[PDB]
Amino acid sequence: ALYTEYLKQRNNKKRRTPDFNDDDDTLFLEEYRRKYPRIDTSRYIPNESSEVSLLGIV
């Protein structure tokens, strides 16, 4: 049905935008951005540690 109609199901376009002084809803959305940014910055650390060695091996 997805291929026939030529329409992909929409994903969560939420984390990217958000807004300060929101409510209890944006309090969650804010706290989401922190944990994923810390996971992000940890996910970039173990890549850079090896760096280009892991890439050129593949």
Binding site: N11, N12, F28, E31, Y32, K35, Y36
Partner: peptide
């Protein structure tokens, strides 16, 4: 798709 999105979204805050 949106369930798995919500469940990861929830676990991220339940860990925080």
């Amino acid at each position: 798709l949106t369930s798995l999105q919500n469940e990861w979204d929830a676990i991220m805050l339940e860990n925080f």
